[PDB]
Structures are given as structure tokens and as C-alpha cells.
Amino acid sequence: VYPQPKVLTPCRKDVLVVTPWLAPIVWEGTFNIDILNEQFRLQNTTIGLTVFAIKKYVAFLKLFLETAEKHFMVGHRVHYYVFTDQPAAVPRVTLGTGRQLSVLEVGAYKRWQDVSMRRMEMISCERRFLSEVDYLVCVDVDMEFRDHVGVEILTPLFGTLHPSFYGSSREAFTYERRPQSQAYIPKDEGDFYYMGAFFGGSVQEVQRLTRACHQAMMVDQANGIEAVWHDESHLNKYLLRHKPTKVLSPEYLWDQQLLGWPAVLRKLRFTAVP
Amino acid sequence: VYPQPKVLTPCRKDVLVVTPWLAPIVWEGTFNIDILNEQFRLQNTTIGLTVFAIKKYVAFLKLFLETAEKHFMVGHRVHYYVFTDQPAAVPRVTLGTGRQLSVLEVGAYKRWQDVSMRRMEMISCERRFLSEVDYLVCVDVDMEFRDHVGVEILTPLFGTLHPSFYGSSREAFTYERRPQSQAYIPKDEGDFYYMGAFFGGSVQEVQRLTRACHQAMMVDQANGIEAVWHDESHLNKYLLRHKPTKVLSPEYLWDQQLLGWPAVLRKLRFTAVP
Ligand SMILES: O=c1ccn([C@@H]2O[C@H](COP(=O)(O)OP(=O)(O)O)[C@@H](O)[C@H]2O)c(=O)[nH]1
Ligand SMILES: O=c1ccn([C@@H]2O[C@H](COP(=O)(O)OP(=O)(O)O)[C@@H](O)[C@H]2O)c(=O)[nH]1
Ligand SMILES: OC[C@H]1O[C@@H](O)[C@H](O)[C@@H](O)[C@H]1O
Ligand SMILES: OC[C@H]1O[C@@H](O)[C@H](O)[C@@H](O)[C@H]1O
Ligand SMILES: [Mn+2]
Ligand SMILES: [Mn+2]
């Protein structure tokens, strides 16, 4: 027993709720969470969440993890995978039932470009995700959850609209524009500008995507060019060619300090920390 | 190179384009057919179309088939499966490249209820669909195509909004309301009223659906009740419990003689014949 959807009275008339390849764009008021929760519960869905916390970024884990417990996939099985050069630095956060955390120890890379960039490499570690989770969600650690982020996001492949470019035209998009880079996207192409900080999908699609992006980055290195926004550039080139089956609205990646809280955002769910 | 989708200016503001379980509702202006065509071509998609033409309904095949050739999945591989008690009566219609037709001979059933109802049984013939097509589309024969019906419909499971109930409230829906019938749907439930004349999906999902509906009809027979709208009733009960991954708007099942051509319908694609 829920509100009857009515085909002649849309809920959101202010935003695009479907892409032109028929992928939902996820905004508050587009979904009934109760229907979706049942769907995903009926398959005993397990969602993995990957997060890197290399060098000083271990400082962000406590709030990340505490807020994930309040807001992320609450009621579903969750497995956190914390990639860190400092395992002893990972805070012990008490978890809800059916939720667990693994610490994966990795190398502290040369500069920030590589730490951000080698995530694609480090996520692709492959045998294990396939056995343990049905979906993988890949996010920045320097963030907090402030509202529901749940199974509405889950789909074979998704990316998230960069909060600075959702209202913008495409020649404005900061894609890689040098044809020397595997990340190259011409000035007459592109659907959206996706942020590197929040993407995911089924384990098979995320392994594909991260393998591709790593193979593309290595090809650029061997040719002496570094895409302008690094992993985000390659992410955007992958998602142009392999279109995501859901797109998350900027409700899912926001910075209230830089951008306020406009009326088109009914919820701010996952936000940057200073 | 196509129109850039703009996230703050929806194309359709007059209709619901997404269900509350995040299934697209397919209306003109929600999709770019060029993007979709490429997607489906890249997988060499084959679509099967099943149609029953038992007794006098062989009379409808010539126009059905001629118009399907102009409008249905044009450019993609298509396999028509014509179920008939009269194989010699099937018109020879010249087909486009990559399109073929098989005649399947079956029994002329006792009354019209059973002819319509035993379709579910006759579609479920199982080994063969799995090998030959990726999707199955199941329609009435007493119809003509008048405009594009293409790969925008394709998804694991879809149904179509009955053209007489899309603007209506749910207690108005002519679901089966006797609890004695497997088709029973309470007065406080239901998302939409789907018509029996146009549903489909992947071969696996259509085999599931048609197996379920046949198993449900047989259980009702053994109990001496016949659902009020027969196969359509069971279809609607299946789609309540297993929600379709796309819903087709009434653009995909219309009767211009009974309903005109309202402004909310930008195309009339598949329509009833007198
Ligand atoms: O020294 C570093 C730099 C980056 N990161 C990881 O790489 C992500 C992206 O980096 P950052 O957040 O600095 O990029 P921004 O959001 O500022 O563009 C971070 O959230 C961390 O998960 C890290 O763990 N240690
Ligand atoms: O004598 C019959 C009655 C029905 N049908 C098939 O069952 C479908 C549904 O029947 P009908 O079109 O009469 O139902 P309606 O659309 O009038 O509700 C038809 O399109 C045919 O495909 C048939 O082949 N021969
Ligand atoms: O334009 C691309 C850049 O946009 C900035 O706003 C953002 O901080 C960068 O991380 C990168 O996304
Ligand atoms: O209400 C259910 C009935 O609605 C009629 O308009 C239609 O002709 C019937 O075929 C059946 O769908
Ligand atoms: Mn960050
Ligand atoms: Mn009919």
C-alpha cells in the first residue's frame, strides 16, 4: 500500500529524471524506497564500499564511517573495504548487524595524482570482490553522509553528475581535449560531466571500468601525457563509450560551502568535508 | 554528435517518464534512438515477435506483417513466430534483410477465452526461443504498426499501459478482485493497469512470466473460477509482484477510433484494427 503513481502528473517536473538512453537519473521524489528495499532484500544483496585513506587521509575515516553507518544502505548487507598505508590508524567504529569492514594494506604512492590515479589499479584485487559482494561503490574518503544513500543507486553501472557542471553546456565540460590522451573527448561529444568521487555498479562492471581506466592511464604514461583531471578524465571517457545504466543527481555529491543548498536539491546526501 | 541532454530542462514535463521503482516509462522525447540503436547493434540483438492467428484472425496477418516490416525493429534482426491453426493461410510478405518468419502449427481451442488464455501456455516451446532470439515481444495480431516501435522497448521485462486506464485511479482498475483467483489483487494495491496485448522482455523473463501465468490459470481451473479478464488478469498480477524494468506508454497500444489523438500522445505507434 503506497501512493499510486499517476502517469499524467509527474512528481519532478523541474529536472531531467531519465537520460536519452533511458537510464534513470536519481533525484528525491523519483523513487519509492520501500519498493526498492524489498526488491533488493529479496535477493539478499551485499554492497561493497571502497574507500582509500592513504597518508593524512586516515583522518577522514572516523566521520566517513560513522555517517556511512547512519545513512548508507541501512538494512542491507554492507562490506567496507578500507585501502590504507596505515592499518593501525583505522578507527574502530561499531557497526550495525550484517555490516563488516576489511582493512587492505597498500603502498603510499609518490604524489597525489598517483594516489587518486592508482585507485583504479588497486580496485582492479579481483577474485575476492566477485565472491563477497554483488555491487561495488567507489568513493572519496574526504566526505560525510548527511542523508539517505541506498539501493536506489544500485544498477549495473552508474556515475554521478559533478556538482559544478550539471547546469552547464558541454564545450564547458573539463574533459581531456588533447587527442594524444586515451581520455580524449572531442568538442562536439559528451553527455554529462561525471565526478571521479562517486561511481559504481555490479562487481563485473566496476572491474571492467577500473581495468579499462588503468589500461588507458598506463598507455598515456608510456606516451608522456597525463590527462587533465587524471582518473576523472578517463572515467568520463569510459562512461561516454559505455553509458551508465543509472546516473546519480548532485544530491549524491555536493559541497554546501561552495554551492549552498539550491531548491532543485531536496536532499544533500553525501558532501565534502573542508 | 547529438543534442546535449540538460539536467535542468526536462523534455517531457507533462507525463511520468520513470516509475517509482526506477523503470523508464517510454514516451516520445525520452529517448535518443540513435544512441540506443548503436547499443543494441553492438550486441547483434535478435528480437522475436510472437503473434497468434487462430481461425478467422489469419485475416489480420497481412497488414500486421506488412506494417511490422515498415516500423518494428527496423535495422535489427527480427524473427516472427506466427502461431496458427492454418499454415497455408499465412500471407507471404517480403521481408527486409536479417528478418525471418516461422509458422508454428497449433490447435484451434474451444472458445475465445481459451485461445487468448492458452497463448501463455503456447509461448512457454521453450528450448527453441533461448537459442534463436535475445528478446521476445508478445502482441495481438488484430493491430497495425503506424510509427516506430524499436529497441527503446527492450529490457528484461516490460508491460504496456492499457489505453483506457492510464489516467485512472487504482480502485478503478479492472483487476481480479475475488480472493478465490490466483489473479487476486486487493483494492489497496496495484501500480498500473497493463494490457495483455503487448508485453515482453528477455527470453528468460518472458518464459518465466508465461510459465507463471499458465500455472496460475490452471490453478484457477482446478478451482472452478476464471479471472475476470482472463490472461490480462494474471498478467497484471505477475507484473504487480515482479515489477517490469520498462513500462511502455499508450503510444504503444492505442485505438484512435475510440480515443482520438490527444496532445499527450506525440505518436500513435501500434493501433487496433476495427
Ligand atoms: O594523500 C592522499 C590523496 C588522496 N587520497 C584518496 O584519493 C581521494 C581523492 O583525493 P582528493 O579527495 O584529495 O581529491 P579531490 O576531492 O580534492 O579532488 C581521496 O578522497 C582519498 O580517498 C588519499 O587517500 N591520500
Ligand atoms: O479466434 C481467435 C481469438 C483470439 N486470437 C488471438 O488472441 C488475441 C487476443 O484476442 P482479441 O484480439 O480478440 O482480444 P481483444 O483485443 O478484442 O480484447 C488476438 O489478437 C489473436 O492474436 C486468435 O488468434 N483467434
Ligand atoms: O573540472 C574538474 C575539476 O573540477 C573541480 O571543481 C574539482 O574540484 C576537481 O576535483 C575536478 O573535478
Ligand atoms: O478492463 C479490461 C478490458 O478493457 C477493455 O477496454 C478491453 O477491450 C478489454 O480487452 C479489457 O482490457
Ligand atoms: Mn575528495
Ligand atoms: Mn486484440
> In whole angstroms, what is the distance from residue A160 CA to residue A171 CA?
19
> Which residues face B247 on adjacent strands?
B25, B159
List phi, psi (to 5°) of B88: -65, -25
Q: Could you tell me the end-to-end alpha-carbon distance of chain A, in angstroms, rounded to an integer?
A: 43
B169 interaction partners in chain A (CB closer than 8 Å): 4
> In whole angstroms, what is the distance from residue B129 CA to residue B140 CA?
19
> In whole angstroms, what is the distance from residue A252 CA to residue A145 CA?
9
Q: What amino acid occupies position A178?
A: R
SS3 content of chain A, % helix, strand, coil (to 5): 30, 20, 45
* Chain-chain contact of B10 with A13 (C-beta, under 8 angstroms): yes
For chain B, give the DSSP string: ------TTS-S--SS--B-TTS-BEE-TTS--HHHHHHHHHTTT-EEEEEEE--GGGGGGHHHHHHHHHHHBSTTSEEEEEEEES-GGGS------TTEEEEEEE----SSHHHHHHHHHHHH--HHHHHHH-SEEEEE-SSEEE-S-B-GGG-SSEEEEE-TTTTTS-STTS--B--TTSTTB--TT--S--EEEEEEEEEHHHHHHHHHHHHHHHHHHHTTT---TTTHHHHHHHHHHHS--SEEE-GGGSB-HHHH---TT-S---EEE--
Residue B34 sits at the chain A interface (C-beta within 8 Å): no
Nearest chain B Cα distance for residue A40, angstroms: 11
Q: How many domains does chain B have?
A: 1
Coil/strand/helix, residue A121:
helix
Cell of A149: 544513500
Instruction: Please report the residues numbered 152 through 171 in chain B whose beta carbons come closer than 8 angstroms to any beta carbon of chain A.
Output: 152, 161, 166-167, 169-170
For A3-20, give the DSSP string: ----TTS-S--SS--B-T
Residue B42 sits at the chain A interface (C-beta within 8 Å): no
Closest-approach residue (CA) in chain B for A7: B16
Query: What is the Å distance from ligand 4's center to B168 Cα?
Result: 14
Tracing cell 540483438 back to the chain, one arrives at B45
Cα distances from B220 to residues B123, B182, B225, in angstroms, run 19, 6, 5
Give the domain range for residue A60: 1-274
A22 interaction partners in chain B (CB closer than 8 Å): 24, 26, 30-31, 36, 152, 246
> In whole angstroms, what is the distance from residue B32 CA to residue A87 CA?
48
Cα distances from B82 to residues B41, B87, B103, B231, in angstroms, run 25, 9, 5, 19
Coil/strand/helix, residue A239:
helix
Cell of A104: 587492505
Q: What amino acid occupies position A22?
A: L
Instruction: Specify whether the CB–CB gap between B46 and A58 falls below 8 A.
Output: no
Residue closest to A122 by CA, chosen among A112, A109, A132: A109
Angle in degrees, 0-180, between the axes of helices A203-221 and A112-123, rounded to the nearest 10 = 140
CB neighbourhood size of A117 (10 A): 25
Q: Could you tell me the end-to-end alpha-carbon distance of chain B, in angstroms, rounded to an integer?
A: 43
Instruction: Specify whether the CB–CB gap between B182 and B220 falls below 8 A.
Output: yes
A234: enclosing H helix or E strand: helix A231-241
Q: Give per-residue burial for B156-183: e unless 16+ CB within 10 Å, then b.
A: bbbbbbbbbbbebebeebebbbeeebbb
Pocket test for ligand 4, best of B170, B195, B259, B271 (most atoms within 8 A of CB): B195
> In whole angstroms, what is the distance from residue B218 CA to residue B108 CA?
19
Q: What amino acid occupies position A130?
A: L
CA torsion through residues B145, B147, B153, B154, sign: positive
Q: What amino acid occupies position B246?
A: K
Counted residue by residue, chain B has a size of 274
Residue closest to B7 by CA, chosen among A192, A159, A153: A192
Please report how many Cα atoms fall inside a 13 Å half-sphere around the Cα of residue B58, on the Cβ side: 17
Instruction: Specify whether the CB–CB gap between A13 and B13 falls below 8 A.
Output: yes
> Which residues face B144 on adjacent strands?
B271
Angle in degrees, 0-180, between the axes of helices B112-123 and B203-221, rounded to the nearest 10 = 140
Closest Cβ–Cβ partner in A2, A4, A30 for B18: A30
Coil/strand/helix, residue A145:
strand
Tracing cell 516490416 back to the chain, one arrives at B69
> In whole angstroms, what is the distance from residue A200 CA to residue A160 CA?
9
Closest Cβ–Cβ partner in A5, A6, A191 for B5: A191
* Chain-chain contact of A8 with B246 (C-beta, under 8 angstroms): no
- CATH code of residue B138: 3.90.550.10
Resolution (in Å) of the shown entry? 2.0
> In whole angstroms, what is the distance from residue A217 CA to residue A231 CA?
8
The residue whose CA has the least distance to atom 11 of ligand 4 is: B229
E-strand ranges in A75-129 read 77-84, 99-105
Cell of B254: 492505442
B68: exposed, middle or buried (C-beta count within 10 Å: 0-12, 13-18, 19+)?
A: buried
Instruction: Specify whether the CB–CB gap between A155 and A205 falls below 8 A.
Output: no
Please report how many Cα atoms fall inside a 13 Å half-sphere around the Cα of residue B111, on the Cβ side: 2
Q: After what residue numbers is chain B broken, C–N > 2.5 angstroms?
A: 124
Residue A1 sits at the chain B interface (C-beta within 8 Å): yes
The residue whose CA has the least distance to atom 8 of ligand 3 is: A164
For A31-74, give the DSSP string: --HHHHHHHHHTTT-EEEEEEE--GGGGGGHHHHHHHHHHHBST
* Chain-chain contact of A7 with B30 (C-beta, under 8 angstroms): no
A160: enclosing H helix or E strand: strand A157-161
| A103-111 long-range contacts, CB within 8 A, separation 24+ | A106/A54, A108/A54, A108/A55, A109/A54
CB neighbourhood size of A176 (10 A): 23
* Chain-chain contact of B8 with A1 (C-beta, under 8 angstroms): no
* Chain-chain contact of B20 with A10 (C-beta, under 8 angstroms): no
A115: enclosing H helix or E strand: helix A112-123
Q: For residue A105, indicate whether it is catalytic.
A: no
Cell of B194: 497493463
